[PDB]
Design a protein around this ligand. Structure first.
Ligand code: NI
Length: 143
């Protein structure tokens, strides 16, 4: 059913690139990409995002900041967004995509993945763990 996944945050330089790569790791046969409702277009992944990722053996290399659009959403069967506030931005930008959008941390007790941008390394450690735990559970479901 859900063969394509679009992972979405704000900048597309911290959370979604990490969520994207975690999910690809777990579900190698699916088309998994990422974008941001406030994306820094053509920007590489955030330095702190790359730090926490490599520290955990995860590779963010080759990433490119990408803007989320209704047109892009059309190519994916499932959208996973980081924040509650993102849900309303999807409704506003892509009304026809809202019906296939869910939180990235839907399966976690607390569902929102907080914004680490500009924060210290330990906030990034924390966000990484949340993304990782959320990813394992999403993979359990789509398997
Ligand atoms: Ni620029």
């Amino acid at each position: 059913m859900f063969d394509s996944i679009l992972v979405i945050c704000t900048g597309n330089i911290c959370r979604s690139p990490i969520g994207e790569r975690l999910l690809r790791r777990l579900l190698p046969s699916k088309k998994i990409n990422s974008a941001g409702v406030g994306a820094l277009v053509d920007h590489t992944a955030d330095e702190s995002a790359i730090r926490v990722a490599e520290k955990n053996g995860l590779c963010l290399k080759g990433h490119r900041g990408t803007k989320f659009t209704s047109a892009l959403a059309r190519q994916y069967d499932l959208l996973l967004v980081m924040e509650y506030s993102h849900l309303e931005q999807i409704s506003r930008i892509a009304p026809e995509a809202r019906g296939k959008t869910m939180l990235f941390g839907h399966w976690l007790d607390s569902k929102e993945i907080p914004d680490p941008y500009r924060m210290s390394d330990e906030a990034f450690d924390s966000v990484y763990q949340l993304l990782e735990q959320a990813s394992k559970r999403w993979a359990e479901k789509l398997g």
